[PDB]
């Protein structure tokens, strides 16, 4: 009953940000020290909680959301931020209680000649609500004329590849991101520190 944070952080494969993965963590002992003492993480930002105090707290559920974005977009995984990722791909609530953790994954997620398998949503009729997920591939109407599912003038495919090459600048290198959300409801608190 050790919380399976390994399965999330050390997953072989990570989701595209538009198709971000969520794992519900419950009914286990969480050793948060494995995370906050790690030298592996380039970002470790907590909101409404102190990372070192986490081993002292109990929650009903922990949600672990994970995906890949480029380095220069990690700043968008924060309450109240704007940009293509926060607006159209993965949106934190203004009142977020949790931690945003990221690390450079250039060694796994970049390939010589480019890895283009990680996508982001470039076009959308409106901003995502917090923790909304949109995996639709409907043709996006950018102009006054309906597309009727046909790409053309002002009628676009809504997703686009990141082009991750190991020689990219750090800003265009792939980062793996895990967002931990800490939920306290009127129920037994099933995820506690040691």
């Amino acid at each position, epitope marked *: 009953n050790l919380c399976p944070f390994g399965e999330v952080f050390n997953a072989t494969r990570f989701a595209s940000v538009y198709a971000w993965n969520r794992k519900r963590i419950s009914n286990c002992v969480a050793d948060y020290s494995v995370l906050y003492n790690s030298a592996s993480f380039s970002t470790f930002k907590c909101y409404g909680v102190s990372p070192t105090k986490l081993n002292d707290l109990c929650f009903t559920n922990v949600y672990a959301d994970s995906f890949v974005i480029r380095g220069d977009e990690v700043r968008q995984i924060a309450p109240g931020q704007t940009g293509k990722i926060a607006d159209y791909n993965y949106k934190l609530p203004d009142d977020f209680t949790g931690c945003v953790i990221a690390w450079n994954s250039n060694n796994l997620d970049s390939k010589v*000649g*480019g890895n*283009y398998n990680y*996508l982001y949503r*470039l*076009f959308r009729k409106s901003n995502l609500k917090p923790f909304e997920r949109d995996i639709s*591939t409907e*043709i996006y109407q950018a102009g006054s004329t309906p597309c009727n*599912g*046909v*790409e*053309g003038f002002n009628c*676009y*495919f*809504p*997703l*686009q*590849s990141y*082009g991750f090459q190991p020689t990219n600048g750090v800003g265009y290198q792939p980062y793996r991101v895990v967002v931990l959300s800490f939920e306290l409801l009127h129920a037994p608190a099933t995820v506690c520190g040691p």
Partner: nanobody
Amino acid sequence: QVQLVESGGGLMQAGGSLRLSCAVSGRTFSTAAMGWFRQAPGKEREFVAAIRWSGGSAYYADSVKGRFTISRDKAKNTVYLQMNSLKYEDTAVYYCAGSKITRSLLSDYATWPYDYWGQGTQVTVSS
């Protein structure tokens, strides 16, 4: 691993039709695209047509609009070029190509790189 195998082409009289087929093994092109290119002697390899694999929207070089049609059969994992109203200057080696890259604007497939190529098929248009 990934093979693009062309069939069809060869000799046809001007105003006639040919149909090129390109059978893909070892990959599907999902949200990216397949295309056709051609190379005449002394000339750079030039874009002919692209198709979004998932949704099937097509993009054409101006030089073949109203004459050539690109299409694909997902079940057969095959892309086609229907070449109608053949012109003498359509004579070239035709290549099918596959892109690894998902681009939002289909017109990007006229200029962005393709990582997978067929063997090349001679098309000759005669009087």
